[PDB]
From Swiss-Prot:
Similarity comment: Belongs to the dihydrofolate reductase family.
Protein name in the entry: Dihydrofolate reductase
Annotated EC: 1.5.1.3
GO biological process: dihydrofolate metabolic process; folic acid metabolic process; one-carbon metabolic process; tetrahydrofolate biosynthetic process
Function, in words: Key enzyme in folate metabolism. Catalyzes an essential reaction for de novo glycine and purine synthesis, and for DNA precursor synthesis.
UniProt xrefs under Gene3D superfamilies: Dihydrofolate Reductase, subunit A (3.40.430.10)
Entry GO MF terms: dihydrofolate reductase activity; NADP binding
Residues binding NADP(+): 7, 13-19, 45-46, 63-64, 76, 95-102
GO cellular component, one term: cytosol
Keyword annotations of the record: NADP, One-carbon metabolism, Oxidoreductase
A Pfam short name: DHFR_1
Enzyme class, spelled out: oxidoreductase
Pathway field: Cofactor biosynthesis; tetrahydrofolate biosynthesis; 5,6,7,8-tetrahydrofolate from 7,8-dihydrofolate: step 1/1
Highest classification ranks of the organism: Bacteria, Pseudomonadati, Pseudomonadota, Gammaproteobacteria, Enterobacterales
Amino acid sequence: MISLIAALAVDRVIGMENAMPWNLPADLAWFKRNTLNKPVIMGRHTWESIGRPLPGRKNIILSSQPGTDDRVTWVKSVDEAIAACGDVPEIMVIGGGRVYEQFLPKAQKLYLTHIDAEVEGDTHFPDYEPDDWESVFSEFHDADAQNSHSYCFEILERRHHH
Ligand SMILES: Nc1nc2c(c(=O)[nH]1)N[C@@H](CNc1ccc(C(=O)N[C@@H](CCC(=O)O)C(=O)O)cc1)CN2
Ligand SMILES: [Cl-]
Ligand SMILES: [Cl-]
Ligand SMILES: [Cl-]
Ligand SMILES: [Mg+2]
Ligand SMILES: [Mg+2]
Ligand SMILES: [Mg+2]
Ligand SMILES: [Mg+2]
């Protein structure tokens, strides 16, 4: 099964973790917990922004060009990315914008962090029809000395497809 995992500011703005305007170690812990021991698929912009393979996960980079780093697995299409994951229970797509857009139709689960921040970025999470999904978990957390903004984790499971 394919899942997307994303952190969304107001207006469903996303960007690279290393440059986003919030500081949420709690969200990074959520991301790690929900991706550990699963393959992660990302585009090249996200890969370059991380710069080092995420530990304890197979890192698959979706790029139309030949790879530039032997520490990760380079693939040229959505289908090839999925094939490279082999037989695993759950494949995690970690962005960015265009990669989420291409994988959303193949996804059956979303892990979202709804962050109470308004920001300047121009990359967005894909449009999804909320009527097609069921919320099976949600937890709000206020900001604290370690986390700059309040945020709400959510897991959604797909019920319909258009
Ligand atoms: N929900 C959540 N989803 C996301 C992001 C996020 O921001 N949070 N941002 C994008 C993914 N980018 C990264 C980049 C780096 C890390 C990262 O570095 N993670 C460490 C945890 C951080 C740490 O404590 O060292 C890890 O091992 O997973 C996580 C997501 C897309 N989806
Ligand atoms: Cl968590
Ligand atoms: Cl990307
Ligand atoms: Cl505190
Ligand atoms: Mg090589
Ligand atoms: Mg889009
Ligand atoms: Mg769309
Ligand atoms: Mg229904």
